[PDB]
Design a protein around this motif. Structure first.
Motif, PDB file in Angstrom:
ATOM      1  N   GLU A  16       3.442  21.220  58.608  1.00  0.00           N
ATOM      2  CA  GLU A  16       4.473  21.344  59.627  1.00  0.00           C
ATOM      3  C   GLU A  16       4.164  21.631  61.085  1.00  0.00           C
ATOM      4  O   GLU A  16       5.019  21.762  61.808  1.00  0.00           O
ATOM      5  CB  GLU A  16       5.272  22.359  59.132  1.00  0.00           C
ATOM      6  CG  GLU A  16       6.109  22.070  57.970  1.00  0.00           C
ATOM      7  CD  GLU A  16       6.792  23.212  56.954  1.00  0.00           C
ATOM      8  OE1 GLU A  16       6.758  24.225  57.504  1.00  0.00           O
ATOM      9  OE2 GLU A  16       7.427  22.826  55.824  1.00  0.00           O
ATOM     10  N   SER A 166       2.826  26.042  50.880  1.00  0.00           N
ATOM     11  CA  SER A 166       3.912  27.000  51.555  1.00  0.00           C
ATOM     12  C   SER A 166       4.831  26.209  52.369  1.00  0.00           C
ATOM     13  O   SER A 166       5.999  26.492  52.801  1.00  0.00           O
ATOM     14  CB  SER A 166       3.463  28.086  52.414  1.00  0.00           C
ATOM     15  OG  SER A 166       2.398  29.101  51.640  1.00  0.00           O
ATOM     16  N   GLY A 167       4.506  24.705  52.898  1.00  0.00           N
ATOM     17  CA  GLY A 167       5.254  23.987  53.767  1.00  0.00           C
ATOM     18  C   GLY A 167       5.751  22.830  52.742  1.00  0.00           C
ATOM     19  O   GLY A 167       7.096  22.549  52.997  1.00  0.00           O
TER      20      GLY A 167
HETATM   21 CA   LIG Z   1       8.980  23.900  54.163  1.00  0.00          CA
END
Ligand SMILES: [Ca+2]
Ligand SMILES: [Ca+2]
Length: 291
Positions: A16, A166-167
């Motif tokens: 991200e 986590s993204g």
């Molecule tokens: Ca995300």
DNA sequence: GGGAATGGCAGTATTCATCCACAATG
DNA sequence: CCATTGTGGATGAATACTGCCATTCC
């Protein structure tokens, strides 16, 4: 307000982060170099932890429900470049980073203040992200090459995977309906979504984790991939141990913890009872979009 | 002191995360 | 029949990514 493991940070950035080069006409041209992470409000703590790790960049409210980490200070961009030299990206975004670095070199020699330097930067920006604007296309006509060397790298380690998950990751508790009955069953799912452009990396997840499938969806000119695991043995033996050992970050960590609670109940076959299925249905209600 | 650098946001398009149906399998 | 597993469907907004005026500074 701790600091993040560098490889986790690279994983999350691969997911991200965004490397930008921006050129606009002033009256000549203004040129800015910028690294940006834009997240939902709920994960402001991530940006603060990244900021705590790099000691650079500003954190700003971006609209009603988003927050952004912006790094535009030229001296501060050195900090970023040095991180990604020691802990390199592995998605196609690495190509954007390379061009970001090439543009950085141009500006370090103050060459963006001359007309010849601008033409070099425009050539670089053409290959970055969404490419040139129509102001730039009009001012610099013709077909400026958008082509770029394709990145083909393996997953460096699980710390990277934890940052990337986590993204882009998803931990889902699914209630299966049937047709002849009204009772529902529980199924756990782990998914990772990504654009088709990183098809080789996604396919390697099967071998890297030891399970799962790759599915593709297509909507007109839109298409993306989905690494998907459903078989409980693989989820219990090959997915959960990985992320228990390599900790996730942000709100998605809390989703993984609730996810593991359900898994333990299924492991102990408490999900085939009714007190167990009830507790699971509660846990489902308060995770992901329910939180 | 004028412009170059940086701050400080809001805006836009889509690539994601997400909840879900239904068929297949043992 | 039940319980698990497979193949995506379909959605909309959290992302990626961008635009531009305001402030700093040198
Ligand atoms: Ca995300
Ligand atoms: Ca991404």
């Amino acid at each position: 307000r701790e600091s993040i493991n560098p490889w986790i940070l690279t994983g999350f950035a691969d997911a991200e982060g965004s490397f930008g080069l921006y050129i606009y006409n002033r009256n000549r041209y203004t040129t800015r170099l910028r690294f940006t992470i834009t997240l939902h409000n709920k994960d402001k703590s991530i940006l603060e932890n990244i900021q705590s790790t790099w000691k650079v960049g500003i954190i700003t409210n971006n609209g009603d429900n988003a927050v952004s980490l912006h790094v535009s200070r030229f001296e501060d961009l050195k900090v970023i470049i040095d991180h990604f030299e020691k802990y390199p990206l592995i998605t196609q975004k690495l190509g954007d980073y390379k061009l970001f670095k090439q543009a950085f070199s141009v500006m370090e020699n103050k060459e963006h203040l001359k007309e010849n330097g601008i033409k070099e930067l425009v050539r670089i920006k053409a290959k970055m992200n969404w490419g040139l604007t129509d102001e730039l296309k009009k001012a610099f006509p013709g077909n400026i090459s958008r082509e770029r060397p394709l990145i083909n790298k393996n997953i460096p380690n699980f710390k990277w995977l934890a940052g990337f998950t986590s993204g882009e990751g998803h931990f889902g508790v699914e209630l299966i309906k049937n047709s002849r009955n009204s009772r529902v069953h529980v199924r756990l799912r782990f998914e990772i979504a990504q654009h088709v452009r990183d098809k080789n990396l996604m396919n390697s997840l099967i071998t890297y984790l030891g399970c799962g499938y790759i599915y593709e969806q297509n909507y007109s000119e839109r298409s993306w991939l989905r690494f998907s695991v459903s078989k409980f043995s693989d989820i219990n033996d090959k997915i959960i141990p990985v992320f228990q050992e390599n900790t996730l970050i942000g709100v998605k960590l809390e989703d993984f913890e609730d996810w593991c609670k359900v898994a333990k109940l299924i492991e102990e076959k408490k999900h085939l009872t009714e007190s167990g299925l009830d507790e699971i249905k509660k846990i489902k209600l308060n995770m992901n979009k329910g939180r």
